[PDB]
Write a protein that binds this ligand. Structure first.
Ligand code: CLA
Ligand code: CLA
Ligand code: CLA
Ligand code: CLA
Ligand code: CLA
Ligand code: CLA
Ligand code: CLA
Ligand code: CLA
Ligand code: CLA
Ligand SMILES: CCCCCCCCCCCCO[C@@H]1O[C@H](CO)[C@@H](O[C@H]2O[C@H](CO)[C@@H](O)[C@H](O)[C@H]2O)[C@H](O)[C@H]1O
Ligand code: SF4
Ligand code: SF4
Lengths: 31, 222, 41, 61, 717, 223, 80
């Protein structure tokens, strides 16, 4: 079978970590 | 003048709509930027290369996630010649009922796209069998890309910014990329092929829970 | 199944909200934020 | 270098680089490009004669 | 250099580019016009000679329903004799689509010696034209006050050229063409047709066809004109034997316009006090003499405009090329819907080719009218003559004219073409009820449907009681069938016709926008304040001011040629699909009409996909499946037109700075083998590369449509 | 559909990386190239040889284009005029023998790995070419897609491909070697990689920069 | 603004000054050629970049060179 609803929500919560780390890389690269 | 773009003072004083278009097309030409020292050029390229690496890992992590969530990978590996790979689902609220019926294809119960990239045939050969295999592969690349975003931010910090002589070391890079990037990665890929991809091709499930028990060979390593 | 958009996958309400959010709810705030960034003096 | 000498241009920016030209006049006043050399092939904008310095010329006859 | 070779052929026929004396310019113009008349008479001599010697015209005149017209035979070299197709009647040749045979039958031609003596008369009159051009230039050339006599020129060309030309043709219709076509439509074979002088010598032979000829010319002088009402008739409709117009309506047409033109040729005052003068008509059109709705044109009005016509030949060429476009557009629209020649309307290859040719002739003439309007403003226009008149005031609100035109072009492009993109998207979604269609959201062209209902109610006979039948069967009435083939039937207008007509209004308004902005900004603009000092034709004024490429009035004619091509391609595509879908076809033995493409214009022409699939992909199967048959020259010309289109984009997309630096390396290799030439190899100029690119683009696209139109219609038409 | 999509994907990617190699090799010659640090070495040779490299690329471009299009239009006029056996059908004998030297016995020429007792087949000092007995079923089967059968229609398109490779190289090499200057514009290196023109003077200088040779070669790369 | 450079190959023919529609160029005394004068570009902030001066220069190669620089309202030629 395919993914469960708890598996999709885990991937959405984990993906906030490269969302934050791409924000701090973008603001460090410059304005 | 305007603040945008911060890298070109002559584009800041441009009073026309040419300022916005030329700021795009010169944004990644770092040498023509205002006050770009030649050592600061290499450090921003190095951190931009970590940003491009993380985009690549996020891209393949999304391909694995959308097949595991909305594809038919476990149904396709039963008979790959009579089945059709599903790329992802369709959500377009302007669809009419004949378009919904036309794209409800390949044995799916919702509108889907047929995958034509061949990633089903690639994951099947290297040993992926379940949607749980594709999910933890998608989570691992979701964290591997965040490591690449960390290393780009880290190697811009003042203690970890590499000097110019480190960037010009064309012997330490050509040795490490031949033996480590090209050699050790091709060695570790053989280690995946003989420990994982060859037993899953022969019906034996090898995962992270049982790979320390099952040998790749009956005459194991002797 | 054949008359409207459904989803036989986990959390089928997610494309019900994400495609409105990504494509026609959030872009005009993002275009306005980017517009204020490139016009500020 | 004087009038009646067919010279050969050494100027890389010129149209007649490595080409033969006929000296029309050579000034004696002290200006920076005295050698007036007339040419056979015209350039890209209708000019067949241009001033050169004596150090950018080599003689043929 | 090699630029001198191209510049000499471009500096050939513009005469004020030399020393500008108007009397000597007017003499070279007057004698060159005799030379162009000799070219037309030489070309007319060829069509009558190939019609007399290399045709199946005598065989076609026996039965014009089942015989295809041919007037070009091909020699048997290189295997090219495959193009000699069976026309019927055992004749092998190329099916002509000019419609010369239908023109010659309606004029009264019956044999191949009458076409021969017409070819000799055109060969004689071509030699008379190239003597009058020699005599009126090299011997006895007129002077400038003879050229400036507008009132004598207008009187002699209305009454003398057009009035006596159509009265003289009404003499040929009445005494030759009316009896010859009356006997042919009543089924009399061509041995028994009298030669056309026997309708004059044997006056009694025309009495039994028209009994009013026994009473002679006497009712004309006594104004008992209703005696003649059997060979000059106000009938309307089509002849049910031929499908052409009634020949007695054609004779009374060329009689009534003859009286109207000879009356028109007494309007102007020449030598006798009576008449209007051109200056008094132009000096009075101003405030406060105009209507109060036209108070905006101001107190000078048209007062300074007669000095334009005294001095500028380019400004008169601008008006006359526009009106030849107006005339040729009328020839296109009126000859399909009121077909004037016998057995023309059911020859579908000829009706296609005649509409398409005269549309294209008109579109080039309109661009030339705007081109020589810009040449007048750059070269011939003097601003001292035009202070606060209608020419000066137009140049003083050119920003309001161009920006209002630019808005209505954007309105017409959204509310015509983007509705097709709406329709493409709605059909792909499976929402046909959301389309702009006759079965979805209807856009009925109710004003054109109202005119069609008026044009039918007028004949009965609410407003024109004198007709029996309709003016055209395209407006209304019934189906005219010749040989179980549709000649003309009512053309229904729906949502597909509303949309394509607003496409035409869009593509014309943009073509006006390119050409009018080129004329109105030809002397100066806010970008280039001295643009008129740089000339009519120049590439740019450098990369500065952001870049000033294509600011000249010549380069707007260059851009206007593409937009004229885009406009007229959709016009002839609208014609070709709608006639095959809703007009042309076959009346079956049941009584039902089966059209060529089966009525698919209403549902398929409303999307871009339907134009791609049902028009372009489906109907091009004749031109691509023609290899190894007699239509194979169309298949070769189809791919040849595709080649020149792609070849033109090398000149349009690139610039000469690349090609000049490419040439120096080939000049280097030619110099190392000691084979240099004196004339120095240059790339084409910036204007030459634009002129070559637009000429090959238009040649490539038109030849492709010509091969596609003529291969399909020679197979199934 | 996947095999068609994957081939077209990676070939169009490869064509884009090829024209960017010449584009960034031309930016190098404008910005980073030092004529004194590279005196009389190989980079100094081609900049002095540049009228010979471009003229030799132009002859191969004109020879291939005249004769491939000439053969195609000749075969077009023969098939259209009802004589399809009058076509000029040159057999691709060089790549058919190259297919025989890889293991195809389909042409029957039986020599050197189309041969059973060849020294390249038996590997006489070794007899250890274990690949071969599995390899020859990949070549001599008709359902796979390695070493397909080629005919005269395959020769004409390989020469059209060679025409497209040589012209796209000719635009990019001439754009790189004339990037520092030509006789039309000798000081082009002080104007940069990308600029519009040098104005309508000197005959006209539209599309003269090295960037505009990238722009022209992108049409030829896609074609 | 643009950059207008005059090089020492100038023969002082005053043709670039006559060709300039923006009055960027003027002649100053030089004693470096036979005519005793050389072109100068004092009002280069008014230069639009039309390169009419380079079209008028008879020296091979040109003694006057225009380098298109930062775009201002004057150099873009905008009346609005
Ligand atoms: C052994 C140690 C080691 C390793 C593993 C690496 C690895 C890397 N370094 Mg290097 N580096 C090293 C030591 C090392 N470095 C040292 C000691 C120095 C100082 C001298 C440097 C200085 C340095 C600089 C300045 C930069 C790098 C960069 C990189 C990255 C190259 C970009 C890339 O992702 O291509 C990965 C390439 C491969 C995996 C091999 C590809 C081979 C071909 C093209 C394909 C063959 C594979 C196969 C056929 C395809 C199958 C795949 C398909 C089935 C999906 C890569 C991660 C660049 C970077 O991006 O930084 C973030 C960069 O700018 N390094
Ligand atoms: C009633 C007398 C008369 C007639 C029939 C014409 C006819 C013509 N003139 Mg006009 N002209 C006239 C009086 C006349 N003119 C007078 C009084 C003046 C001085 C004010 C001019 C000043 C003038 C100028 C400056 C020009 C003309 C031109 C023309 C031609 C128009 C362009 C064209 O190609 O037409 C279309 C052609 C036809 C419709 C075919 C019929 C024309 C035939 C072949 C002409 C020869 C036959 C014969 C002379 C006419 C019949 C008379 C005969 C029965 C006695 C046409 C031939 C132009 C031209 O082309 O010159 C060569 C031109 O530039 N005319
Ligand atoms: C403009 C060219 C033209 C020419 C050259 C002729 C010439 C002729 N007409 Mg015709 N006719 C014309 C136009 C012309 N017509 C028009 C426009 C009408 C309609 C009003 C007529 C109506 C007409 C009638 C009713 C008759 C003639 C007749 C004649 C012939 C003798 C006339 C006579 O001698 O007095 C003569 C051949 C007479 C004749 O002999 O018939 C054959 C005769 O009875 N004509
Ligand atoms: C009665 C009609 C008429 C007359 C008398 C003129 C007369 C003139 N025109 Mg005008 N013009 C016309 C119609 C006319 N034109 C039309 C219909 C257009 C729209 C296309 C124009 C657009 C136009 C422009 C843009 C210009 C002129 C110019 C001129 C002047 C010089 C012409 C010249 O030297 O070219 C000599 C003739 C040629 C060089 C022949 C080339 C024509 C094409 C490219 C070739 C023919 C293609 C062929 C049909 C396809 C077959 C291909 C096959 C053989 C392979 C001359 C006063 C020029 C001028 O100097 O004004 C100040 C100018 O720049 N005309
Ligand atoms: C199919 C290709 C294409 C398209 C879409 C356009 C579009 C346009 N042209 Mg262009 N043109 C084209 C080909 C095209 N052209 C080519 C090939 C040439 C070379 C000859 C030109 C040369 C040219 C000239 C010389 C001029 C134009 C002008 C215009 C504008 C006309 C006004 C209008 O219709 O507004 C409505 C807009 C459209 C119809 C564009 C499509 C809009 C889509 C259907 C709506 C959906 C978008 C959606 C909201 C996005 C979310 C319009 C933007 C003119 C202009 O600027 O007039 C003011 C003008 O003078 N064009
Ligand atoms: C758009 C308005 C319009 C137009 C273009 C025409 C046109 C025509 N009318 Mg008509 N007419 C009209 C309105 C119009 N009419 C109206 C409102 C009436 C009152 C009901 C008439 C009553 C009328 C009569 C009684 C006759 C005409 C006739 C004609 C024809 C020629 C004579 C003429 O007067 O012109 C011409 C086709 C005459 C005709 O039948 O010519 C053959 C004729 O005898 N008309
Ligand atoms: C790994 C591959 C790679 C890398 C690191 C670069 C990097 C660069 N390129 Mg290169 N290039 C590449 C591949 C690459 N390119 C390829 C494959 C092509 C052929 C398509 C080119 C053709 C090319 C040209 C013609 C030019 C560059 C330029 C540049 C520089 C500035 C880019 C910029 O500011 O625009 C940023 C672009 C955007 C923000 C969006 C552009 C989107 C496009 C228009 C669609 C930057 C050093 C420019 C340069 O160096 O100027 C002197 C330049 O003129 N590149
Ligand atoms: C005249 C033709 C020619 C020949 C026969 C060679 C031969 C060689 N080149 Mg050279 N090359 C040449 C011209 C030539 N070069 C030119 C003109 C350039 C500038 C584009 C180069 C750029 C080049 C680079 C960057 C390198 C070589 C290298 C080499 C060596 C490669 C040895 C190996 O296989 O590892 C070999 C001696 C490699 C080397 O240096 O090994 C000694 C190397 O790194 N070549
Ligand atoms: C149908 C389209 C078409 C055709 C046939 C050509 C043909 C040619 N191009 Mg062109 N090109 C085109 C479209 C086309 N181009 C487009 C759209 C662009 C983008 C603007 C270019 C940009 C371009 C560049 C940048 C260059 C070429 C060059 C060439 C020549 C290549 C050498 C050769 O093959 O000689 C054989 C000749 C032919 C195949 C055509 C001749 C016609 C035959 C013989 C009938 C007469 C050839 C004349 C190159 C060149 O000139 O090298 C010497 C060159 O550098 N082209
Ligand atoms: C340059 C020209 C400008 C063109 C402007 C076009 C703008 C959009 C046009 C729509 C306006 C007229 O559209 C008009 O709407 C009504 C109401 O839906 C349609 O009505 C039709 O379809 C709807 C479908 O639900 C039914 O309710 C109705 O029974 C039926 O008659 C008409 O077919 C249409 O003629
Ligand atoms: S690109 Fe060509 S046409 Fe445009 S300004 Fe430069 S030289 Fe003139
Ligand atoms: S570029 Fe134009 S404005 Fe500037 S100096 Fe030259 S001619 Fe004058």
């Amino acid at each position: 079978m395919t993914l469960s609803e708890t598996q999709v929500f885990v991937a959405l919560v984990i993906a906030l970590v490269p969302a934050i780390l791409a924000f701090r890389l973008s603001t460090e690269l410059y304005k | 003048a305007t603040k945008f773009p911060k890298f070109s003072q002559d584009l800041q004083r441009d009073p026309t709509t040419r300022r916005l278009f030329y700021a795009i097309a010169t944004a990644h030409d770092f040498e023509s930027h205002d006050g770009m020292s030649e050592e600061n050029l290499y450090q921003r390229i190095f951190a931009s290369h970590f940003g491009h690496l993380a985009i690549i890992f996020l891209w393949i992590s999304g391909i694995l996630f959308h097949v595991a969530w909305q594809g038919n990978f476990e149904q396709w590996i039963q008979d790959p010649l009579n089945n059709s790979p599903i790329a992802h689902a369709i959500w377009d609220a302007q669809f009419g009922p004949p378009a919904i019926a036309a794209y409800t294809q390949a044995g799916a119960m919702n509108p889907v796209d047929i995958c034509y990239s061949g990633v089903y045939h690639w994951w099947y050969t290297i040993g992926m069998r379940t949607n749980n295999d594709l999910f933890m592969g998608s989570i691992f690349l979701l964290l591997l890309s965040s490591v690449m975003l960390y290393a780009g931010w880290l190697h811009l910090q003042p203690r970890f910014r590499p000097g110019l002589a480190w960037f010009k070391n064309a012997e330490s890079r050509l040795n490490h990329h031949l033996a480590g990037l090209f050699g050790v990665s091709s060695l570790a890929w053989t280690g995946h092929l003989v420990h994982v991809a060859l037993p899953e091709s022969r019906g034996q499930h090898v995962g992270w829970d049982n790979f320390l028990s099952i040998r790749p060979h009956p005459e194991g390593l002797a | 199944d054949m008359t409207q958009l459904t989803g036989a996958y986990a959390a089928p309400w997610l494309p019900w909200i994400m495609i409105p959010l990504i494509f026609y709810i959030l872009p005009f705030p993002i275009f306005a934020i980017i517009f204020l960034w490139i016009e500020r003096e | 270098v004087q009038r009646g000498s067919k010279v050969r241009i050494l100027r890389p920016e010129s149209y007649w680089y490595r080409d033969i030209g006929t000296v029309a006049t050579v000034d004696q006043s002290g200006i920076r490009y005295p050698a007036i050399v007339r040419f056979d092939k015209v350039n890209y904008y209708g000019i067949s004669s241009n001033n050169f310095a004596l150090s950018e010329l080599e003689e043929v006859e | 250099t090699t630029t001198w070779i191209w510049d000499l052929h471009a500096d050939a026929h513009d005469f004020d580019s030399h020393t500008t004396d108007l009397e000597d310019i007017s003499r070279k113009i007057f004698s060159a016009h005799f030379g162009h008349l000799a070219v037309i008479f030489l070309w007319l001599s060829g069509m009558y000679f190939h019609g007399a010697r290399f045709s199946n015209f005598s065989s076609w005149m026996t039965d014009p329903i089942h015989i295809k017209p041919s007037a070009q035979v091909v020699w048997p070299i290189f295997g090219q004799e495959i193009l000699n197709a069976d026309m019927g009647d055992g004749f092998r040749g190329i099916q002509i689509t000019s419609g010369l045979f239908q023109m010659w039958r309606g004029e009264g031609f019956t044999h191949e010696f009458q076409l021969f003596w017409t070819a000799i008369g055109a060969l004689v009159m071509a030699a008379l034209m190239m003597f009058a051009g020699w005599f009126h230039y090299h011997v006895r050339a007129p002077k400038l006050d003879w050229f400036r006599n507008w009132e004598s020129m207008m009187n002699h060309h209305l009454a003398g050229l057009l009035g006596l030309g159509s009265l003289g043709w009404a003499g040929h219709l009445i005494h030759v063409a009316l009896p010859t076509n009356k006997l042919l439509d009543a089924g009399v074979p061509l041995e028994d047709i009298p030669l056309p002088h026997e309708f004059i010598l044997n006056k009694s032979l025309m009495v039994d066809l028209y009994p009013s000829f026994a009473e002679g010319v006497k009712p004309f002088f006594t104004l008992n004109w209703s005696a003649y009402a059997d060979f000059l008739t106000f009938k309307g409709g089509l002849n049910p034997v031929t499908g052409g117009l009634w020949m007695t309506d054609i004779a009374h047409h060329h009689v009534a316009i003859a009286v109207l033109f000879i009356i028109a040729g007494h309007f102007y005052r020449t030598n006798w006090g009576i008449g209007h003068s051109f200056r008094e008509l132009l000096d009075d059109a101003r405030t406060p003499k105009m209507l109060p709705i036209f108070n905006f044109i101001g107190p000078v009005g048209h007062r300074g405009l007669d000095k334009i016509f005294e001095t500028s030949w380019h400004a008169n060429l601008a008006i006359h090329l526009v009106q030849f476009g107006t005339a040729s557009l009328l020839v296109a629209h009126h000859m399909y819907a009121m077909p004037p020649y016998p057995y023309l309307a059911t020859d579908y290859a000829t009706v296609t080719s005649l509409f398409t040719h005269h549309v294209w002739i008109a579109g080039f003439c309109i661009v030339g009218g705007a081109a020589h309007a810009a040449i007048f403003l750059v070269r011939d226009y003097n601003p001292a003559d035009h202070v606060n008149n209608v020419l000066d005031r137009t140049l003083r609100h050119r920003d309001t004219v161009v920006s209002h035109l630019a808005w209505v072009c954007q309105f017409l492009g959204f509310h015509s073409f983007a509705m097709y993109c709406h329709n493409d998207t709605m059909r792909a979604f499976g929402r046909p009820q959301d389309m702009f269609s006759d079965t979805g959201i209807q856009l009925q062209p109710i004003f054109a449907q109202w005119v069609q209902q008026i044009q039918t109610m007028a004949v009965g006979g609410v407003t024109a009681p004198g007709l029996g039948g309709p003016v055209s069967h395209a407006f209304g009435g019934g189906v005219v069938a010749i040989g179980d083939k549709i000649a003309m039937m009512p053309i229904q207008l729906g949502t597909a016709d509303f949309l394509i007509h607003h496409i035409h209004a869009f593509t014309i308004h943009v073509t006006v926008l390119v050409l009018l902005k080129g004329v109105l900004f030809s002397r100066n603009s806010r970008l280039i304040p001295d643009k008129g000092e740089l000339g009519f034709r120049f590439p740019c004024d450098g990369p500065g001011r952001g870049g000033t490429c294509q600011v000249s009035a010549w380069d707007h004619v260059f851009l206007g040629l593409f937009w004229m091509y885009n406009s007229l391609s959709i016009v002839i595509f609208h014609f070709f699909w709608k006639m095959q879908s809703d007009v042309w076809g076959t009346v079956g033995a049941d009584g039902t009409i089966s059209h060529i493409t089966g009525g698919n214009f209403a549902q398929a022409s409303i999307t871009n996909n339907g134009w791609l699939r049902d028009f372009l992909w489906a109907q091009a199967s004749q031109v691509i499946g023609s290899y190894g048959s007699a239509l194979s020259a169309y298949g070769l010309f189809f791919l040849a037109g595709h080649f020149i289109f792609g070849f033109s984009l090398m000149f349009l997309f690139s610039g000469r700075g690349y090609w000049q630096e490419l040439i120096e390396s080939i000049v280097w290799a030619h110099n190392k083998l000691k084979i240099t030439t004196a004339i120095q190899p240059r790339a084409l100029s910036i204007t030459q590369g634009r002129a070559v690119g637009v000429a090959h683009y238009l040649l490539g696209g038109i030849v492709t449509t010509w091969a596609f139109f003529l291969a399909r219609m020679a197979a199934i038409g | 559909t996947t095999m068609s999509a994957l081939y077209t994907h990676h070939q169009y990617i490869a064509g884009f990386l090829m024209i960017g190699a010449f584009a960034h090799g031309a930016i190098f010659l404008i910005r980073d190239y030092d004529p004194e640090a590279n005196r009389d070495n190989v980079l100094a040779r081609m900049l002095a040889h540049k009228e010979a490299i471009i003229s030799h690329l132009s002859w191969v471009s004109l020879f291939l284009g005249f004769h491939t299009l000439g053969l195609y239009v000749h075969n077009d006029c023969e098939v259209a005029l009802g004589s399809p056996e009058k076509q000029i059908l040159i057999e691709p004998v060089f790549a058919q023998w190259t297919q025989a030297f890889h293991g195809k016995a389909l042409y029957g020429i039986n020599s050197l790995l189309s041969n059973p007792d060849s020294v390249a087949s038996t590997a006489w000092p070794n007899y250890g070419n274990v690949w071969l007995s599995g390899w020859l079923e990949a070549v001599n089967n008709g359902a796979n897609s390695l070493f397909l059968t080629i005919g005269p229609g395959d020769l004409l398109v390989h020469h059209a491909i060679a025409l497209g490779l040589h012209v796209t190289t000719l635009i990019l090499v001439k754009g790189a070697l004339d990037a520092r200057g030509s006789k039309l514009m000798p000081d082009k290196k002080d104007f940069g990689y990308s600029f519009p023109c040098d104005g309508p003077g000197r005959g006209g200088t539209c599309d003269i920069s090295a960037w505009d040779a990238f722009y022209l070669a992108t049409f030829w790369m896609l074609n | 603004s643009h950059s207008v450079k005059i090089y020492d190959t100038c023969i002082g023919c005053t043709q670039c000054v006559r060709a300039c529609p923006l009055d960027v160029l003027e002649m100053v005394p030089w004693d470096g050629c036979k005519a005793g004068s050389i072109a100068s570009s004092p009002r280069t902030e008014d230069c639009v970049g039309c390169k009419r001066c380079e079209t008028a220069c008879p020296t091979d190669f040109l003694s006057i060179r225009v380098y298109l620089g930062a775009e201002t309202t004057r150099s873009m030629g905008l009346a609005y």
